[model samples]
Target: SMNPPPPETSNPNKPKRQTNQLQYLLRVVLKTLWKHQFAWPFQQPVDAVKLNLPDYYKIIKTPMDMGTIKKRLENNYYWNAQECIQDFNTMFTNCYIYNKPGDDIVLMAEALEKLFLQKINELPTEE
Candidate 1:
């Protein structure tokens, strides 16, 4: 959980840019998701009482929201693309769990999930 100290034993003079290129590309996809018309429902954390779903919390134990993901992205909380993918999947999966199969919100979630996959395909294959 801690940021380790730099190892200076070898090649100390050679600078190494350990930047994660996927993170930057994923940020673009995230922004696109935010701009999507169907994105609003998944933007923030679900409010159980506000949405009249008292069992929301009990059903969704590990809640994932776009806003929280964006915050984590900004804070450099993710270390790889898989983590990003998992979070996005969680956000969409929650919709399927809480709403009916043919519900409008569920359809929107499906659309957004497809958009996300499409966007990621456009990202460069290598750094």
Candidate 2:
């Protein structure tokens, strides 16, 4: 009969902990991409007139009401709701398409809100 091989020994002097360098690097890259992707939306505008919770419900609760509102906005240059919506949609879609696969819509909306506010601020106030 052959003798059994000697048992392996663990080295107490050596540390067995593993470093997560790959995870860390991935996080950094993702964070950078997210920041860049959100930048444009951050600079866009919000549609307060349409997006106001109570007003939105009042205006959009029925299809007839929505159609009237759309028609009014399209006809009136001073009240260009369609243009605003188009801009917001375009900017949002661009950000979504160019950014990482799973960007949050709420965050994008918030950024667009800031952009809208900035645009309002830049408008010349009537004397």
Candidate 3:
């Protein structure tokens, strides 16, 4: 969150750039889900499903409407918690297991969880 994302610019020479609307939405949603899923401990990803969704439509509503938002929500780009779990399990099992001692998984999970949590910790709660 700190570094910066490049954006479409009017003046190519200027560093003054807008955060891409799609990029911003993607960050908030993933960051939010990481918190929700790992806040306690990630026993499973299926339980992490609780985003209010189309309400999210407001965040980056550039050329907007609910119909488009609803359609997009179910698409590959942002399918819900099970999708999150599916991907997470694959990575964690393939990665964490091979990379760390089995005893370290819990600690690693907690610390890594803290990493994402810390990123979003001070982000605004704009409900």
**lDDT scores in order:** 0.73, 0.35, 0.36
Q: What's model 3's overall lDDT? A: 0.36
Q: Report the error of model 1 at residue 49, Å.
A: 1.7
Tens digit of per-residue lDDT, candidate 1, span 10-100: 3435433323544654468889999999999888777666777778777877788887777666655655666667888888888898889
Error of 3 at 28 (Å): 3.4
Which candidate tops lDDT? 1
* Cα lDDT for residue 39, candidate 2: 48
Residue-wise C-alpha lDDT for candidate 2, range 70-119, written one tens digit per residue: 22223332223233344335444544543455457557545644654454
Regions more than 4 Å wrong, model 1: 1-22
The lowest-lDDT stretch of 10 consecutive residues in candidate 2 is: 61-70
Q: Which of candidates 2 and 3 reaches a greater lDDT?
A: 3
Candidate 1 local lDDT, residue 46:
75
Give the winner by TM-score.
1
How would the candidate models be sorted by TM-score, starting from the highest? 1, 3, 2
TM-scores of the candidates are 0.79, 0.26, 0.26
